[PDB]
Design a protein around this motif. Structure first.
Motif, PDB file in Angstrom:
ATOM      1  N   UNK B  16       0.964  -1.218  -0.047  1.00 36.28           N
ATOM      2  CA  UNK B  16       0.214  -0.063  -0.008  1.00 36.28           C
ATOM      3  C   UNK B  16       0.756   1.327   0.124  1.00 36.28           C
ATOM      4  N   UNK B  17       0.457   2.275  -0.670  1.00 34.30           N
ATOM      5  CA  UNK B  17       1.154   3.406  -0.886  1.00 34.30           C
ATOM      6  C   UNK B  17       0.161   4.856  -0.571  1.00 34.30           C
ATOM      7  N   UNK B  18       0.648   5.826  -0.154  1.00 32.14           N
ATOM      8  CA  UNK B  18      -0.147   7.023  -0.027  1.00 32.14           C
ATOM      9  C   UNK B  18      -0.842   7.452  -1.294  1.00 32.14           C
ATOM     10  N   UNK B  19      -2.121   8.188  -1.308  1.00 32.15           N
ATOM     11  CA  UNK B  19      -2.622   8.736  -2.433  1.00 32.15           C
ATOM     12  C   UNK B  19      -2.009   9.999  -3.037  1.00 32.15           C
ATOM     13  N   UNK B  20      -1.898  10.049  -4.432  1.00 29.67           N
ATOM     14  CA  UNK B  20      -1.153  11.196  -4.715  1.00 29.67           C
ATOM     15  C   UNK B  20      -2.511  12.695  -4.929  1.00 29.67           C
ATOM     16  N   UNK B  21      -2.184  13.638  -5.180  1.00 33.08           N
ATOM     17  CA  UNK B  21      -3.086  14.903  -5.019  1.00 33.08           C
ATOM     18  C   UNK B  21      -3.998  14.779  -6.294  1.00 33.08           C
ATOM     19  N   UNK B  22      -5.082  15.460  -6.132  1.00 32.26           N
ATOM     20  CA  UNK B  22      -5.897  15.463  -7.326  1.00 32.26           C
ATOM     21  C   UNK B  22      -6.071  16.800  -7.975  1.00 32.26           C
ATOM     22  N   UNK B  23      -5.994  17.067  -9.133  1.00 40.55           N
ATOM     23  CA  UNK B  23      -5.898  18.455  -9.835  1.00 40.55           C
ATOM     24  C   UNK B  23      -7.244  18.892  -9.754  1.00 40.55           C
ATOM     25  N   UNK B  24      -7.419  20.225  -9.522  1.00 37.98           N
ATOM     26  CA  UNK B  24      -8.638  21.089  -9.374  1.00 37.98           C
ATOM     27  C   UNK B  24      -9.044  21.598 -10.708  1.00 37.98           C
ATOM     28  N   UNK B  25     -10.473  21.706 -10.750  1.00 40.52           N
ATOM     29  CA  UNK B  25     -10.762  22.467 -12.054  1.00 40.52           C
ATOM     30  C   UNK B  25     -11.705  23.796 -11.927  1.00 40.52           C
TER      31      UNK B  25
END
Lengths: 100, 99, 54, 829, 87, 101
Positions: B16-25
């Motif tokens: 398991x690995x930490x989740x990455x950032x999500x790009x906004x709109x």
């Protein structure tokens, strides 16, 4: 939004009537259910001189089947003209508080 | 060792690995200069949003071609069932603006 | 790379001095232990052979 | 994973010596000012500094090596963590949803176990699990006046909730022979049963031949003919009976999935199923759409055009859809089978419904063997448990005394004979002990952080010196006392008993390890046993993979995971955390109410019948006997568990077997029924009444309790009269006695209800209020309790609790059969 | 496809089919058959390839004067004729 | 990622939906109810920022939002369960104190 309304789109033509517009509607709001884009092509015979509505402006009319509950209708808070959608790039190099 | 023991279990065995950032709109409205009847803004056009707190620039990419013109939405009115009552929440010829 | 043989009553610092004499930069007792995968600083027996790199 | 490349400068001897000299300056700078190489105090300190550097070097070894115990201890099939703690058991879960049962049942393979035939295939192409339909709901009737329950219809209606109908769509090989498929399915259904639920009906869909008429035109420059036939058949077969798409773990990783969603749902041994086809409804006629078959066929290289796509001769089970040119309705209970029993033979036939034409007017014929050769077999995926293999065990525990590094002039190399040498040896001893303990502490690391099979020690200690040494001889007379202190300061439990500080440390380690899996330690006991409490916590941590994977699973003669979770949360009854605990007298027991009910029988056998053959056989190596009854015209009409109080056990052929173990009356009148058979007047039928209402014996309490008036008496619970589980105040009573108002009988008592029988000796205490304590325990348990369940508390005296335990254990040992033990269990509740 | 207004879907399908079967109209950028034949099933596959189309339930082709063909009937053209789709 | 216990429902619902402030489930007194329960009833207290009404002290969610929560949570439950999420019933508690400032 809370429900998907039943919408029929019309435009004011030179014959002082409401011509059907549903064939040229690109609805990304899922019938006024959630925020999104909304694009149409204005027909060649649209009129801004017709007496059905105040002159000088082209008019579009949407007919909605009546909903018994007044709270089911969406809460519009603004409409943007000439609108486009943009997305962030290089998100891995941005500070966290920007996303928060 | 207690901290390194748990990390070995979560990351190496369970994978398991930490989740990455999500790009906004964002939604952008474009106003054309008075000498252009129509303009085409291709997909992938870059827009500037300034910089973050640390100074890294912020840029956004357009997602769909836009065929802009000189028009502007000015009026919004409707009538409802009851008889029928009508109202004009928005109008630019008049000075009535949306709340 | 140099090779040394372990004799009786030798300590790890003494092995490093003997092994590191020929090397250009010598060697320390910690580095020598790591290169030989020793379990501890006394994890060798007489008659064993150790190696020392640059 | 090694700290040495990071800390190799802070471990060096010179760095540590500088720190030691700084402390000496600060604390004793005006009395110890000579700190050069010649100072005897420094030489002793310098030796200890080398030992401190050696101890620090051991800690800077690779992490996986320090977690590996000796070779003689390393368990087979495990690694740094045991096999059951891998991702395939810690991120998955047992089938809970209807979709999960689809995934688990579709994973069955003919090669999973030892097999009778060497054909590799998946049993089912598709399955569908649904709740029992309302029309066919499990109904039974209560007689208002007769006070009894019957399956035959003022009678009142009662319904049992929880029942599954399993629709099976078999594969081609499965339809050839179903004996192996049926046997494996029964085993899976037995071990994957949820609490309060069961499969009351198994339905097999029947095949209907779907002769598809297909006309295909080829390109003029086609090279291979048999290849195109294989592609056409493979594409068409998939379009009609689309099979699940499986992937290996590596393939799912390559597709962009993460381990969070790869190991989601039940653990499948033969590939992962991310997306399934839309679940069909098999209680009504289904649909078959083949409009897209044109798109796929034209995409085959070498295929130019399609001229006809229609349905040939079909019976009434297939009908065209309304206004749809390429859709058909399949009758309920049937599935479409493409081109009959042998497809490839039909295609190679002269009357083949599939026609292939090239060059305008040349017909192409390919033998069956060529098409078989061009059809490839999908490789068999097999996902093994993931492991972090054992590292290299390192002799960290070995200790070398630090006095051996001093020069010979100090007198510590030869055997001590003077006072000065002995005093120096005694001065160094506490420092050697501290270094040795640090070495022993690091060697204890695999046991300290172990998930299972934890030990008795929480701190590492050892005697610094070996045998036949100079140091051993000096401390010969003091060794037993120091070793006794070392054991006292380290062991959780010793001869003196519980070490409070060591007990607290063990709880903290368990609580820290329990936080890995989103749980936490139970509260410390106040009126319980410390050793028993520790067993609950250690067993709770050790069985974490099984407990949560089978969170809702229950099997016969096995302690359910629900019972273990309740015991662990309350810290009571650690005897239930070890297997085969059939003699440990657990403080409480859990009973599933549905297990005390019979299977709804067929309505044909309500009337009496005469057997056509009857015999009695004695089981080998036992005193019991089996009564074998044979009746013709009963194939597929009798079920296991069909029910005075005699249950059908076997359905082998046309004969069903009863057992004398479940009924003492049968074991007594076995001659009478044999005589009745001899004269041909022995009749059997479905029991008109299978279980009656509950009436309690009248037992008077002792005179001391009789403090009431002339119309007030106190009635006590007796071994022949269990306490009523639903008694409410101001309820009318009729005298044996029963409740005049029968609303208790109308209430449903078998749908998702569990009974918890608890010994009452636990609350026997001067300072314990049972009712307030009971309320607190329910509040603590409620958070982890299943949402759709209800529990009934039965308080039993320490005497009748033993009788219940003896009866329940015997009942579960026999296979949980309805009978004297089962009916006695029903009465006790 | 669910969520798509049928009138909008039909309008877009007309543009896609006109582009495919009348290549000369849209600035002659795609090499397509010279209006010789219209095959029933290749046309059906073309319609179902649109992202807005879920499934075709019925299809019919009728020439200017001849009667409407049955299922699977193609349309031919004379040596001096060019077929044009109309709605 | 599956629903069996009350804690599982609360934990999973709060993870998925950001409009929830807290989710309540029945007290331990109803787990001994012999007639059992066909429907599992929860109480969802929403964050005032996401309320569908005007009163901040008594937030109310739109029935459409509650329907989506039920649909999402039912996909990870046993088929023999019926989970229902409803707006809370607010009860005023009059508090009066005599004070020395």
């Amino acid at each position: 939004g809370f429900k998907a309304l039943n919408l029929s789109w019309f435009y004011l033509n030179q014959s002082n009537t409401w011509g059907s517009l549903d064939q040229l509607v690109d609805d990304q709001t899922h019938n006024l259910f959630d925020q999104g884009t909304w694009r149409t092509l204005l027909p060649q015979d649209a009129s801004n001189q017709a007496t059905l509505m105040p002159t000088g402006r082209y008019w579009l009319k949407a007919e909605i089947t009546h909903q018994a509950e007044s709270q089911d209708y969406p809460k519009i808070k603004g409409i943007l003209y000439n609108a486009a959608t943009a997305t962030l790039i290089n998100a891995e190099l941005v500070e966290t508080d920007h996303f928060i | 060792f207690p901290a390194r023991h748990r990390d070995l279990y979560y990351r190496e065995l369970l994978g398991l690995s930490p989740r990455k950032a999500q790009a906004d709109s964002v939604a952008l409205g474009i106003t054309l200069n008075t000498d252009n009847a129509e303009y085409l803004i291709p997909k992938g056009t870059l827009f500037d949003a300034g910089q973050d707190s640390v100074g890294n620039p912020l840029q956004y990419t357009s997602e769909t071609d836009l065929l802009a013109n000189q028009g502007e939405l000015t009026d919004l009115r409707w009538y409802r069932k009851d008889s029928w009552q009508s109202t004009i929440p928005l109008s630019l010829s008049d000075n009535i603006a949306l709340p | 790379v140099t090779t040394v043989s372990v004799t009786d009553m030798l300590t790890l610092p003494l092995i490093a001095l003997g092994a590191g004499a020929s090397l250009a930069s010598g060697i320390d007792y910690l580095s020598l232990a790591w290169q030989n995968d020793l379990d501890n600083l006394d994890d060798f027996t007489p008659g064993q052979t150790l190696q020392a790199q640059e | 994973d090694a700290l040495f490349p990071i800390v190799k400068d802070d471990i060096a001897f010179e760095t540590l010596l500088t720190q030691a000299k700084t402390v000496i300056e600060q604390q004793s700078g005006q009395l110890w000012s000579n700190t050069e190489e010649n100072d005897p105090g420094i030489t002793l300190l310098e030796a200890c500094c080398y030992g401190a550097s050696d101890l620090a070097y051991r800690h800077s070894l690779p992490l996986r090596d320090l977690l590996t115990p000796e070779k003689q201890e390393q368990t087979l099939g495990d690694g740094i963590f045991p096999q059951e703690f891998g991702p395939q058991q810690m991120l998955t879960c047992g089938p809970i949803t209807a979709e999960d049962y689809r995934r688990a049942l579709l994973d069955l393979h003919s090669s999973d176990t030892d097999n009778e035939t060497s054909e590799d295939y998946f049993f089912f192409n598709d399955v569908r699990l649904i709740c029992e339909p309302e029309s066919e709901r499990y109904k039974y009737w209560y007689n208002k006046e007769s006070r009894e329950y019957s399956f035959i219809q003022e009678q009142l209606q009662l319904t049992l909730r929880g029942n599954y109908w399993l629709y099976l769509l078999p594969n081609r090989e499965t339809e050839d022979d179903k004996t192996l498929t049926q046997k494996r399915l029964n085993d899976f259904l037995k071990d994957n049963r949820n609490l309060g639920e069961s499969v009351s009906k198994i339905i097999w869909l029947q095949p209907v031949d779907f002769l598809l008429q297909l006309d295909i035109e080829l390109d003029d420059d086609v090279s291979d003919l048999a290849d195109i036939f294989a592609q056409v058949y493979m594409t068409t077969e998939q379009m009609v009976l689309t099979s699940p798409l499986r992937y290996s773990t590596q393939a799912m990783i390559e597709q962009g999935y993460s381990n969070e969603e790869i190991f989601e749902g039940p653990y499948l041994h033969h590939g992962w199923i991310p997306e399934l086809s839309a679940a069909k409804d098999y209680t009504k006629p289904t649909e078959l759409k083949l409009s897209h078959l044109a798109n796929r066929l034209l995409a085959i290289p070498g295929v130019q055009n399609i001229t006809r796509l229609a349905l040939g001769k079909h019976d009434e089970n297939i009908s065209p859809l309304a206004d749809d040119s390429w859709s058909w309705t399949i009758a309920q209970g049937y599935y479409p089978r493409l081109w009959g029993n042998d497809p490839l033979d039909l295609i190679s036939s002269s009357a083949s419904p599939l026609t292939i034409t090239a060059k305008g007017g040349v017909k192409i014929t390919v033998s069956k063997q060529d098409i078989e050769n061009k059809i490839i077999a999908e490789p068999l995926i097999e996902t093994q448990p993931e492991l972090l293999n054992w590292g290299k065990h390192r002799k960290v525990l070995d200790y070398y005394p630090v006095s051996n590094k001093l020069p010979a002039c100090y007198g510590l190399q030869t055997y001590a004979e003077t006072q000065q040498q002995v005093h120096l040896h005694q001065f160094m001893l506490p420092f050697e002990q501290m270094l040795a303990n640090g070495c022993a502490e690091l060697a204890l690391l695999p046991k300290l952080l172990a998930f299972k099979q934890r030990g008795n020690t929480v701190y590492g200690t050892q005697w610094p010196f070996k045998a036949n040494t100079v140091g051993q001889q000096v401390h010969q007379e003091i060794m037993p006392d120091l070793i006794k202190q070392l054991n006292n300061d380290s062991q959780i439990n010793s001869d003196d008993g519980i070490h409070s500080q060591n007990y607290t440390k063990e709880l903290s380690i368990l609580n820290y390890l329990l936080e890995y899996f989103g749980t936490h330690r139970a509260a410390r006991p106040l009126t319980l046993d410390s050793l028993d409490f520790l067993s609950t916590q250690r067993g709770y941590l050790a069985q974490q993979p099984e407990l949560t994977y089978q969170r809702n699973n229950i099997r016969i003669d096995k302690v359910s995971a629900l019972q273990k979770r309740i015991a662990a949360r309350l810290g009571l009854g650690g005897k239930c955390f070890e297997e085969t605990s059939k003699l440990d007298e657990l403080p409480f027991y859990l009973i599933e109410h549905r297990q005390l009910l019979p299977v709804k029988p067929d309505t044909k056998f309500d009337k009496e019948q005469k057997p056509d053959k009857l015999k009695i056989k004695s089981v080998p190596n036992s005193k019991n006997q089996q009564l074998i009854i044979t009746q013709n015209g009963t194939t597929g009409q009798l079920l296991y568990g069909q029910v005075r109080g005699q249950m059908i056990t076997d359905i082998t052929g046309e004969s069903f077997i009863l057992d004398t173990r479940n009924s003492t009356a049968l074991a007594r009148s076995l001659i009478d029924v044999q005589n009745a058979y001899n004269d041909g007047n022995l009749y059997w039928c479905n029991s008109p009444v299978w279980m009656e209402d509950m009436d309690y014996q009248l037992v008077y309490a002792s005179e001391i309790y009789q403090t009431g008036t002339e119309n007030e008496r106190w009635i006590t619970s007796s071994p022949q009269s269990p306490f009523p589980a639903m008694i409410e105040e101001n309820d009318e009573i009729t005298l044996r006695w029963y409740f005049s108002s029968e609303k208790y009988a109308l209430a449903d008592r078998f749908s998702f209800v569990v009974s918890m029988v608890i010994n009452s000796q636990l609350v026997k205490n001067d300072d314990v209020d049972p009712y307030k304590l009971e309320s607190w325990a329910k509040t603590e348990i409620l958070a982890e309790f299943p949402a759709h369940l209800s529990m009934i508390i039965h308080w039993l005296s320490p005497e009748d609790f033993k009788d219940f335990v003896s009866t329940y254990q015997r009942w579960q040992n026999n296979g949980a059969p309805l009978g004297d033990e089962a009916y006695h269990v029903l009465e006790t509740l | 496809v669910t969520g798509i207004n049928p009138d909008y879907g039909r309008h877009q399908l007309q543009q896609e089919l006109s582009r495919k079967y009348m290549p000369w109209a849209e600035d002659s950028a795609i090499g397509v058959t010279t209006g010789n034949r219209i095959d029933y099933y290749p046309l059906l596959a073309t319609i179902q390839q649109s992202p807005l189309v879920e499934r075709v339930t019925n299809l019919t082709l009728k020439k200017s004067s001849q009667t409407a063909g049955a299922v699977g009937d193609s349309v031919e053209a004379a040596d001096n004729e060019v077929l044009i789709l109309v709605w | 990622n599956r629903v069996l216990s009350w804690d599982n429902i609360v934990t999973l619902l709060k993870e998925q939906f950001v409009s929830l402030f807290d989710v309540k489930y029945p007290s331990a007194s109803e787990l001994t109810k012999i007639p059992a329960q066909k429907e599992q009833q929860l109480i969802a207290i929403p964050d005032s920022r996401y309320k569908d009404n005007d009163d901040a002290l008594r937030p109310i969610l739109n029935p459409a939002r509650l329907a989506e929560m039920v649909d999402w949570i039912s996909q990870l439950s046993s088929p023999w369960t019926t989970l229902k999420i409803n707006n809370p019933t607010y009860v005023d508690v009059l508090i009066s104190y005599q004070l020395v400032f």
